[PDB]
């Protein structure tokens, strides 16, 4: 359960990174 | 306390996701 939460957080972080990159472009 | 912090972080992540989706739209 801890690791599923960790990986959901990582996915959210990746989504934020991708949206920031899209804004950059 | 750890789990309340976890859930606040999850809520913040969900808010970021929703705002990113709104920007997409």
UniProtKB/Swiss-Prot annotation, chains A, B:
Record's subcellular location: Endoplasmic reticulum membrane; Cytoplasmic vesicle, Secretory vesicle membrane
What does its PTM field state? Phosphorylated by AKT1 on serine and/or threonine residues.
Summed up, the tissue specificity of this protein is:
Expressed in intestinal crypt and villus epithelial cells.
Describe, as the record does, how this protein assembles with itself and its partners: Homotetramer. Homodimer. Interacts with TRPC1, TRPC3 and TRPC4. Interacts with TRPV4. Interacts with SIGMAR1. Interacts with PML and AKT1. Interacts with IRAG2 (via coiled-coil domain). Interacts with CABP1. Interacts with TMBIM4/LFG4. Interacts with CEMIP. Interacts with TESPA1. Interacts with TMEM203. Interacts with BOK; regulates ITPR3 expression. Interacts with BCL2L10. Interacts with CHGA and CHGB.
UniProt note: domains: Composed of a large N-terminal cytoplasmic domain (CD) followed by a juxtamembrane domain (JD) and a transmembrane domain (TMD).
Family assignment? Belongs to the InsP3 receptor family.
Record disease entry:
Charcot-Marie-Tooth disease, demyelinating, type 1J: An autosomal dominant demyelinating form of Charcot-Marie-Tooth disease, a disorder of the peripheral nervous system, characterized by progressive weakness and atrophy, initially of the peroneal muscles and later of the distal muscles of the arms. Charcot-Marie-Tooth disease is classified in two main groups on the basis of electrophysiologic properties and histopathology: primary peripheral demyelinating neuropathies (designated CMT1 when they are dominantly inherited) and primary peripheral axonal neuropathies (CMT2).
**What is the role of the protein in this entry?**
Inositol 1,4,5-trisphosphate-gated calcium channel that, upon 1D-myo-inositol 1,4,5-trisphosphate binding, transports calcium from the endoplasmic reticulum lumen to cytoplasm, thus releasing the intracellular calcium and therefore participates in cellular calcium ion homeostasis.
Q: What is this protein called?
A: Inositol 1,4,5-trisphosphate-gated calcium channel ITPR3
GN (gene name): ITPR3
Span within the full-length protein is 2624 to 2648 of 2671
């Amino acid at each position: 359960i801890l690791q599923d939460k960790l990986n959901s957080t990582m996915k959210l972080v990746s989504h934020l990174t991708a949206q920031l990159n899209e804004l950059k472009e």
